[PDB]
Amino acid sequence: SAEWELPRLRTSFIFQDDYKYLQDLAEFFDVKFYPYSPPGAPPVFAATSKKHAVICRLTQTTDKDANPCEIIQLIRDDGNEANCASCWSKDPITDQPLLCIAGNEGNVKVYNVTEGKLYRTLVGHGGGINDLATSPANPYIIASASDDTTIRIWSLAPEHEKQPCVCILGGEGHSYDLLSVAFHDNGRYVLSAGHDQVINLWALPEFPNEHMEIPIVIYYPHFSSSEIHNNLVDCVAFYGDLILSRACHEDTIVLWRIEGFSSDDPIPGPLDAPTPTDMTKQTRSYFTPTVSPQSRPAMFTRLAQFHTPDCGVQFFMRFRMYHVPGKHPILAFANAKSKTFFWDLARFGEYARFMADLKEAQQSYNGRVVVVDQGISLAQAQQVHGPGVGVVMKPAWLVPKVSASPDPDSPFGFSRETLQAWADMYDLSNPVGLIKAHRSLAIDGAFVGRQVGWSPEGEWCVVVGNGNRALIYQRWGKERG
């Protein structure tokens, strides 16, 4: 059972200050779970501070007082740069884990973590690196986003060893420092965003399985917009074909879509891309649908806004989705004022089905509707109340405090305050509405969230941030009372 269960705080740790001699200065900027372990293996994450990579294993415990977190490796970057970015790859010959770390010097350091060794360095960027992402379709392909305003795509495959830069995303798509890069599941589309307030989608060509003397240069994104947000953008992800992004000063994570974009369609080529012909258009797209009453059809649709209060003027704060077949998709993000927020996306759909049914029943039976919790069948509740009364099955998680109940003690419907509270959390009808978190957990101290990670099976969520602190939330625990 327990598919509806959301996480709770289980463990926290403070890793020693490692930057005060080189604002309070120490931060965990990144955390990433190793994704290539066999099903069921204990989950492993790397947390990246300005100077160290802290590699931890999580094991579920029966003892509430026991420590599920063990630190199995600790690497110091003994150079003179601050790091802020990581991703995982694998050695193409040994299949051993590779941890990629980058920061303000502008090189990607690739570490053999099990042996505690530098495997190689990726050199080429002209400024600091702010983000790294590994391709889901190919674990040897890594994208880096930089202050040089470009994205470089690298291959760790042996055939590209002499010249590991396979692609540069350049031209004039971006004009300022990049903060975020993300791959589509198919490995052929890349999202990028930063200080210029532009979110770009790029289509990558197939990279040959041989030595490339030069990278393939892409001059134009296939979709471009500075219109979704009104501020710098510091975190971009795909959610299937949909897009999630956040900007500074807004207190939201925006779910939106590119009109006409489907990853089932063939991958467009470089010369299908639009070009900025009119400097007054702040959105352009190859994907645009041809049928609309507007002369220039809408190129994107804002779908929903997750409310993320009290981020203030803070930026460099990233959210993360747990998205695995057979489990509920969960969004997690920590703000700049000591809270962690969770949304279970599968609640939306059940709530929607429940209010459609409740609305139908109210119209058909003149408000004579009795709701009964799921977990008594529909058929047998209908016998009990008779054929004059509508019966609606309500999800068990949907807990009380479409028209409201006539009076407080009526047997039909719910109070206005019940309905409002539910709507705040679950109603998706307003693209510029604010969706309250399904769960909001307080953090002791003053904590700014930098990054969130989920274990492969979704039982752990690790949030990292300032003061080199890590917060480890759990669900489906084995703890005995």
Partner: peptide
């Protein structure tokens, strides 16, 4: 007014 990357 101005955006900030570091913790307050």
């Amino acid at each position: 007014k101005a955006a900030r990357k570091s913790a307050p």
